[model samples]
Target: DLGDSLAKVLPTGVKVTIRHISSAPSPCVALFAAPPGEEPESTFCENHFLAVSISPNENEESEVIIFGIEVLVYGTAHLTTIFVSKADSTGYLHLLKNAPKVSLLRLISNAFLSFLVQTHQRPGVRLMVSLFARAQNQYLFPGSIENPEKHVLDDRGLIKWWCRVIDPILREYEPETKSSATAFLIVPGCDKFETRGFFPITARSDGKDRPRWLNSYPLHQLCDNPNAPPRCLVPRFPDDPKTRFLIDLDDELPSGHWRSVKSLAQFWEMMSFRQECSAGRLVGFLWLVINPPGLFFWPDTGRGHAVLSEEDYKAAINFLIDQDFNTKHKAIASTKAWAEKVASLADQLWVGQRVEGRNAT
Candidate 1:
């Protein structure tokens, strides 16, 4: 039994009360002047919305919808509107001008409730790789490295460092795939950070300075090519039968016996039945599930076999690794997770290599 306190304090009008069994004021309507803390003077105010008491019993352990300052207001004739506020570190409320409709909310909430049932979730060793990358100065390596010789010298040490550092992290997480790790030290010819780009490198070939040069194309330049693969060209395979993970936004959806989805809602309905809703959520959930150092479910699952198998983890990791992001939403990549992974990977591979010509001189 673990305990954690709510990070944000409850402001005015928030209350917690246990449900009572007997002598509970039956069908009661007790009205009072709003509590004396910055209370708005108007009832049914135009700009403000409201939320009735939330049913906590309905919430699942895995997914939490910890809404702050719920305001419940009576709308025109039996129509009750629920307003929930979310904020960042500062107390300012976050406004969702294009928030999904109430129907979608219920659908998403239900989908989450369903997904929470199956246990065994964890982030991938790529999580460690990503984190490792971010730590190395190579997380923002020199663009000059793209010139081959400098790329090898700068990246070799870092690549070697990552293999050593990440091995333990991967073992802790226990990745399914046993391939050698790779990283690109991003560098710039300019002193200012703005003029910088990433150069790709890897921990393969026993830490030799064999850097992947052609893999250094930017995402925007590939937009003109219709047949272009996804951005973020990271190596996925070894040299013998070389394979690189391509980021493709136009990646196809899972195929079945050709079922037609009439509308987005209908598509969502179909996904709901198949137990996947909100493609983003599926990616997030699967990443948490298949990767090792396994996800600690909100309510812990104490079983041993509950951990994800190597095969299942590989399938999920490989599927996401190849995603392309052409459009905006497809690029709704988890920036946080990506940054964390890059940082960790960079840290592991921070050793500096000296170029042959430069070292000899």
Candidate 2:
């Protein structure tokens, strides 16, 4: 028993009654109805849920906690790195001023990955390592009016624009989870095989509608209806339109599709007119490299609202890659310079990886 200075105001042992209530076991597995042409009963599945428990501390009265994690298995395994920034009480201004290099790296990564995923069909996982330190100003916290800019498009500019875009839909489709805080990354694993030379970023919240830019950029959509299907934001490629899906140079070109340097230049010229072209008509453009035509660009929805011509796309990719390289070089240099100092603080709770299979978790 613990006693305090005001003990005289209370009674001893206080005849406290502890009532025990038991809950019935609930089903651990959930199944979705199969689509047409699918087997009534099959082994192939989507995400798998697993429950895990961790001991809090080794005190006389130990505490244990349990949580569930969902895993997705598809295609070649890949690792993704994401950086999250949440401003504390003070505005993100200080952090931004001092951490410009870090901010640039993350932004570049986001745009670059959007392009990469547009070209590649592989499903990759992301590991979000919170990059910036939270501000400690109470009046200027995350949702405070004093610092509204902190939440816009990962805090670039525009105030509450992201919230306006995501909030209403979430309210309408309330899931089991009450709140809809977005997750920075959804990483697969931390293996060398999973480590690609590049990393992609996303702005996916649990039950929020994805942004329209995602439809045009990395996640090239086969369906035009941005809000259609009404479930997941990760875009899917149509099987029938192989050319629109992904450009595999190894595969034979479709009839009337040119594959020569002069033809490509002419195609690029036509592609330059994409923003002005009709939605149903082909843009007459594709992504090319010195090696192979790695990606193909098209607007299936026919809106041509966010369409980019071949020249513009090329310029955008070049700009993003150049920025990525510059920031990556700086990050590496800074990291190497302070490697020993950072390692000395390895025991700190906030530093290093926190996910299992990686260094920290």
Candidate 3:
């Protein structure tokens, strides 16, 4: 199981835990982890937002809310596809934020693997190519004025560094010993990705690096694009409410359906100019295929994931930060006056008649 390998590979003091903290729109299992042993207080939290529609139009005939974390994880054709969501890692620690920062990459990668195994119940997957590195301020949190402690990596360094993070995961989770798995570093247009110990996935005769297996899952469908053929009614927005809605005919599945190019060159070029992937930015999408499907193990899936409204999550995040003071200094709570306050939110989630706009939060 990943639990044992997880503990073995992690650095000295890192510990992981998942708690059922929110259930406003639906239930959510919050994951908390920190490395506390003489170091400064460091913690990262992750959970699914309440059910929200990803649809662009506030008015739509059919709507289906998806309950999930910011990161995209889907199982199709014996493959567990994990796409880095707008939400990956967020915390208040900068212990390894200096030069020669593969350790920082290591910390983030290991903890995420633990999250997938534990929080997301994805231990069943054997092979994983984690695209955890940031080519720029690509996602929600970057080492900018907002988050000074965050680390930064250019597109080239991103490929190299993320390879370094997976180095040990491949080393520790040895296929020779027990589990059997492999990794193929996928980076189209980045012909320089072959450097170092990375085994680059070679482009075919047609020069197409995008694998046939890449689009096996219902990925673009999950993205809220009205133009593409509707796989399902995904009427929910992902995390990061203030994120962008671009009109550019850019990128792959994450973008809308109007421009689903079969050519790898066009796809990479399209992604290159997308808001997040452009302006000196790049995003990495990884796939972990579990051959036996049920050979490995998974963490607890008893708790439900909340598809929270933006407002709901806004309160939850503030509550989470406030809770930090309580847990750190061990504070007491006794201001009991929420009988009517809590019910107002509780009554709406099971709504049927008038489907609210995707703008609630």
Candidate 4:
């Protein structure tokens, strides 16, 4: 089609033929030509063909058609852009340096398509193409990079990286479906809520005054080991059904206990880490908290435990808020003064806890 279109505008006695078409990284058209009388050769010559490529604008209304000329100097192929005006055909002939318009156009089209093929084979270029494709309609592109020199954290860069590389891979574990309620939870450290006994005070294994249980097992370990019981008592709602085997957080494990632990967050984190090193493997969970509130169990093997109920979930929020105040007097004073301001909204809250893992079928 392109050869036929170019044939109409070129000089008489000049023949135009397509060489090849490439469709990776972008779409490109390669064109070749021969002298008016001689038969065309199967192999293309650098000075004998032209290449054309079209890159569409994001708005979808306009496009840029790039024309390239190929020249071979000492065995190396050199390609350059040729200026073509849609308004004036005769004027374009003057810029070709005494070469025929049709012959030069063929060389340019072939050269441009070759360039496209070479660029598409590169790994970095291929990755950028994938990033752009996934970023569309995801509110992740056209982001500004304010300064390249600065080493400070860039919100735009972090978000773009997450959307382009991380989000798609994460979708494999937990898909973005209509039935799922997706929510992100950022856990607050104990330093923020400085109230002593905020978390139910328990005797320290190490005689020190600090919360030994909390310090011993990091959040990552808790989420990683299913056999190791949690170090905190997560209150359950009154309406929720009781778990078959209740393991208290404060209780110590029996001697010579060995069992393989499997975790949701741990599994997700390792899979992501295997792909890239700079990826954030933080100790937060992406809750796929399903809708149509019903009993959801963990293990498929032995007594699968149901997750916390709505009422207990709210109580967990209250405990976190209560930890913000030091004393009962302080809590009473703040409660009356800023009841509306300080109260935690359940919709905006998420509580993280680890339960025993069984074969979840």
Candidate 5:
């Protein structure tokens, strides 16, 4: 019902269609929308889209009890949700009408801003881009440009770098409150040393025990390699050292963890999902930090994981060229331009105010 009404008013280039209606978890309607004639195979692509979910509350007077919006970019999904009174439906509809422009712009703004922060605050954006560039140019693993003896940047380093980039964004977006003051970064089935380069103080069950709260499996086969560079680095809360950071990747049921295996793409997917969860008070961020020049999952695929073969590496360069990153300078310049546009539009639309109201108490 909500999807059809919004579709009639949405911009001509965008398509809106009902995807799901749920009653068990809660009564809700899920809608998917994308640019006209574009069917997305995975969440990470150039195609732009929006996912909306509306849930009604029986006790509430508002027919639209809850409204959730997700703006999906290349891979990141920026989310916004709110509880609305029936009285606010008129204003809500107005917001919905402008959503394609407003919400998409908002997500772009967030991604751009995050890039800016990484670039200016900690050299993360540059570092990551450099890694990608090196991968394409030399067809070698990241961090291999430098002498391994002199400069050791492994998965652990990558994880630490990501934390530096993500932590500040979370602090600005999801500030702590009295009810929930701490946030955790959970990594399953890996020892503390594997993720953080140290042993954890909070040990439970066996010495190699996983988090008891959920069932998960070991990511060692897919992500860990003692012989070569580590594929991923899981991190713990720097502030809350007592709280463990890694959990397990299990194949169990409703009681088990959601992911059985780990991949770079799956990491971002889960992060997007976790941030949208109503119960995500404790976990602040989810990330998959991959070591350069390895077999990695394509963040958007279900079972696709492979290293860059000879032709594959050449294809990467081709893709980069098509995206107009023919050279290192061009890539950096293009990224900067993209970030600036996001910042400008975000300010114009006052998207921060909208997000503040939804996230901050």
Candidate 6:
């Protein structure tokens, strides 16, 4: 009952009925999907259908335009943090500007961070995000805008461009989430991990090798929770899990694919020539780390896509870890089946159900 104004603005991919409640700050609005068995708690939702849409003017609720983002917020083991996961713009959001006169991205980010901090603050708490910066129609709210307007950057420029988007954010907070964003470079059978660290003053300066933020950076364990070991694997496609999948897959996950790079400069030089990284209709693998988190999640179709969050799921995944599945060839064949099963689930959840296989035209 607390400002369901956004609920009225329907779009595709929102199969569940949208309901909202107020947050700690008046400027922030939180909404979740009222799936069959969800709790009444708004502070932390088990469901994935939670987001905050920001508008410059909170006045007339009938303004017909606002920018909404899909976020995954997890608080577990004495830590509370928010992860701004996805974005959607209604109408022409780029046509507007804030008082500071920045782009829609910065405005919504600042306002949302303020809301999360003012309300959800705690000692070791942080906020993190893992998303790509390709310009296209809205993700969570597909077709919300006939064709949104974004001046897409080139592969290299887009990666660096997203870095700039997150630069101020890095300085604003200490990044205990040590808030880091990672980019990816996958070769024939090789994946390398690289990182960009931000501190008090030096983060703002140029490294000579340290380029100012623009878009994304190289692939690395940027999203790893501070308390855990460096075990999370980079998601090849969007919405890929941070788990065995990476969490505990151990050998169940791809063991031989990833190799670490000595530096960022070398990674991109090799990345630019890859077809997936260079060609048209390619995706940029970027991750923004907020906090090491937890959740009771939901999805649209297997309503697929589970990130080893539930007991049934964790148990199922753990089963694979301990058992001896016989020969290497047998184990390898069986796991590819698991890979496909979860792989499509991530696609359906993030790319929106029906539109998944219908690429191009």
lDDT of each: 0.21, 0.22, 0.33, 0.23, 0.25, 0.35
RMSD of 4: 33.5
**lDDT-better candidate, 5 vs 6:** 6
TM-score per candidate:
0.16, 0.20, 0.43, 0.16, 0.23, 0.41
lDDT digits (tens) for residues 1-361 of candidate 1: 0000110112222221110000111121211112223332222211111111121223321111111111121121211111111110110111212322232222222222122211212223211112111111111112212322222212333333323322322222222322322222222121213211222122232223532221222222212232222211212212101121111211332321113532323332333333212222211000011222322433422111012233433332233234422322222232123223323333432111111111111
Best lDDT among the predictions, by candidate number? 6
Candidate number of the best TM-score: 3
Q: Model 4: per-residue lDDT, tens digit, 1-361? A: 2343333444544322222211111112221222234443232111211223221222331211123222221110111111111100111122122334233433333333233232222221111001111111112001111212112223333323322222222232222222211222222122323312222222113234322212111233112234433211111111111111112211223322213213323322332333222233221111111122121222111111112333443343234233222232332343233222212322323211112112122
lDDT string, candidate 2, 22-122, tens digits: 11112222122222344322222122111111122223222111111122222212212221122121122222222232232222223222322232322
Instruction: Show the lowest summed lDDT stretch of 10 residues, model 1.
Output: 85-94
List, residue by residue over 79-175, the lDDT tens digit for candidate 5.
Answer: 1111110000011222133234344322322343343223222211111110110001112122222322222234334334334433334444212
Ranking of models by TM-score: 3, 6, 5, 2, 1, 4
| Count of residue pairs whose backbone atoms collide, per candidate | 48, 9, 14, 13, 12, 27
Worst 10 residues of 5 by lDDT: 126-135
lDDT score, candidate 3: 0.33
What overall lDDT, based on C-alpha atoms, would model 4 receive against the true structure?
Answer: 0.23
Instruction: Sort the candidates on lDDT, descending order.
Output: 6, 3, 5, 4, 2, 1
- Indicate the residue-level lDDT of 34 in model 1: 22
Superior candidate under TM-score, 1 versus 2: 2
Q: What is the clash tally of candidate 5?
A: 12
How far is 149's C-alpha from truth in model 2 (Å)? 5.5
In model 2, which residue pairs have backbone atoms overlapping below 3 Å? 88-135, 89-137, 90-137, 114-218, 125-187, 125-188, 126-186, 126-187, 279-302
- lDDT, residue 105, candidate 5: 25
- Identify the superior model by lDDT, candidate 2 or candidate 4: 4
In candidate 3, stretches whose alpha carbon ends up further than 4 angstroms from where it belongs are 1-72, 75-79, 86-105, 118-133, 137-151, 171-179, 192-266, 269-278, 281-283, 293-361
